[PDB]
Amino acid sequence: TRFHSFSFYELKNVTNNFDERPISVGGNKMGEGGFGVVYKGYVNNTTVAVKKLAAITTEELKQQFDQEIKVMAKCQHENLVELLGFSSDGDDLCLVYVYMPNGSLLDRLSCLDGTPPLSWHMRCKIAQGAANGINFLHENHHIHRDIKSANILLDEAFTAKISDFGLARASVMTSRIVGTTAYMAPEALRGEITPKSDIYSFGVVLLEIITGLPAVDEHREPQLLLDIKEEIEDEEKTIEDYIDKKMNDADSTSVEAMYSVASQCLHEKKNKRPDIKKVQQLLQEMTA
Ligand SMILES: CN1CCC(n2cc(Nc3nc(OC4(C)CC4)c4nc(-c5cnn(C)c5)ccc4n3)cn2)CC1
Ligand SMILES: CN1CCC(n2cc(Nc3nc(OC4(C)CC4)c4nc(-c5cnn(C)c5)ccc4n3)cn2)CC1
Ligand SMILES: CN1CCC(n2cc(Nc3nc(OC4(C)CC4)c4nc(-c5cnn(C)c5)ccc4n3)cn2)CC1
Numbered sequence: 001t002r003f004h005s006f007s008f009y010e011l012k013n014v015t016n017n018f019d020e021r022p023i024s025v026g027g028n029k030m031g032e033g034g035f036g037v038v039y040k041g042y043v044n045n046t047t048v049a050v051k052k053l054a055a056i057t058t059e060e061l062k063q064q065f066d067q068e069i070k071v072m073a074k075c076q077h078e079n080l081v082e083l084l085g086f087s088s089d090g091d092d093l094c095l096v097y098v099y100m101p102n103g104s105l106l107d108r109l110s111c112l113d114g115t116p117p118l119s120w121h122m123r124c125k126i127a128q129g130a131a132n133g134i135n136f137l138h139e140n141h142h143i144h145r146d147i148k149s150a151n152i153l154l155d156e157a158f159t160a161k162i163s164d165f166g167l168a169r170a171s172v173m174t175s176r177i178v179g180t181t182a183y184m185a186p187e188a189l190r191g192e193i194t195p196k197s198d199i200y201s202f203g204v205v206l207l208e209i210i211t212g213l214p215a216v217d218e219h220r221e222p223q224l225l226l227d228i229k230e231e232i233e234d235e236e237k238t239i240e241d242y243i244d245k246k247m248n249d250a251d252s253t254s255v256e257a258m259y260s261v262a263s264q265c266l267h268e269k270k271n272k273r274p275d276i277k278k279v280q281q282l283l284q285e286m287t288a
């Protein structure tokens with residue numbers, strides 16, 4: 001697959017000079033990370049998302065921009081975001097993607113901008129879709145290294161689409177430890193590079209789908225959502241205590257079936273964790 005080489009001013013045109021005001025206000029800014037700002041645009045009579053990279057050295061940022069392109073050139077799947085083009089220019093790095101009508105999983109779980117809560121049926125399909133996207137990357141010998149709800153984007157049909165490949169690796173140890181701390185496997189925080197870590201991170205994403213809570217809340221007991229696993233095992237709290245109350249269609253059997261998959265993904269021992277193929281098989285058996 002080949003990408004369109006855009007000019008910074010030819011991208012400044014579609015985003016109305018990268019209007020930093022929100023969409024609701026009438027601007028073009030639709031969100032931010034980690035590591036730049038996602039902007040709304042229209043080009044070839046189609047809506048696009050333009051991410052403007054912000055500088056955590058600028059030489060290391062350029063490497064992630066390059067990794068992104070390399071992975072996006074090789075990998076293409078139904079449950080993966082598609083790269084449209086990029087702007088190289090003089091210290092101005094921008095990536096172009098197709099606009100995701102429903103934004104991110106993080107934002108739909110928090111009902112940001114007054115969006116309706118996701119039903120348990122929509123949540124099961126989003127989890128299945130995301131596991132299919134991770135399956136494609138693991139089959140194509142890639143490790144994402146940053147599986148999180150802000151990187152699981154959603155289209156008009158709520159089709160889960162994995163994004164941000166700026167840290168992905170082919171198929172081990174490393175001195176430069178990267179990823180999101182609230183989602184990292186114990187061994188990943190220790191410098192190991194294994195697709196078994198991507199499973200741990202997906203286990204956190206699943207607890208977010210069950211609870212509607214963020215992975216980390218400094219003003220919460222426990223601060224890390226992955227710790228609720230221990231509270232449940234210790235009978236300190238139940239799964240019912242943690243189930244998102246913003247659902248009317250969540251049956252106790254399939255919620256506990258999804259919790260079982262998350263609990264297994266969240267094993268301390270990377271080898272005692274199921275592979276993405278077992279994850280997909282369990283998530284499929286959950287909608288039966
Ligand atoms: C600082 N940086 C700014 C941006 C700059 N730049 C890149 C392009 N275009 C481009 N670059 C590719 O190489 C990489 C990813 C940059 C290293 C590339 N690679 C593949 C490919 C196919 N299979 N695989 C495994 C990879 C396909 C298409 C590609 N197109 C234009 N400007 C590079 C330097
Ligand atoms: C200042 N800077 C401006 C921009 C300029 N620049 C141009 C490119 N274009 C590019 N580069 C590739 O390089 C590698 C090998 C991926 C890294 C590349 N590779 C493949 C390919 C297909 N199979 N494999 C194994 C690789 C296809 C197309 C490609 N296009 C990248 N940077 C550099 C200097
Ligand atoms: C300031 N600067 C602006 C940009 C301008 N510039 C344009 C290019 N375009 C380019 N460069 C490639 O490769 C090199 C030179 C980076 C390594 C390249 N490679 C492949 C390819 C296909 N298979 N493989 C394995 C590689 C395809 C297309 C490519 N296009 C390079 N510099 C120079 C001056």
Ligand SMILES: CN1CCC(n2cc(Nc3nc(OC4(C)CC4)c4nc(-c5cnn(C)c5)ccc4n3)cn2)CC1
Nearest residue numbers: 030031032038049097099100101102103104113163164
């Ligand atoms: C009420 N409504 C307000 C509007 C709302 N909404 C829709 C979008 N569309 C969107 N947003 C992206 O980014 C986020 C979620 C803002 C941060 C995004 N990102 C990429 C991407 C792929 N890789 N990388 C590195 C980035 C591709 C496509 C995208 N599409 C944003 N908000 C829906 C609900």
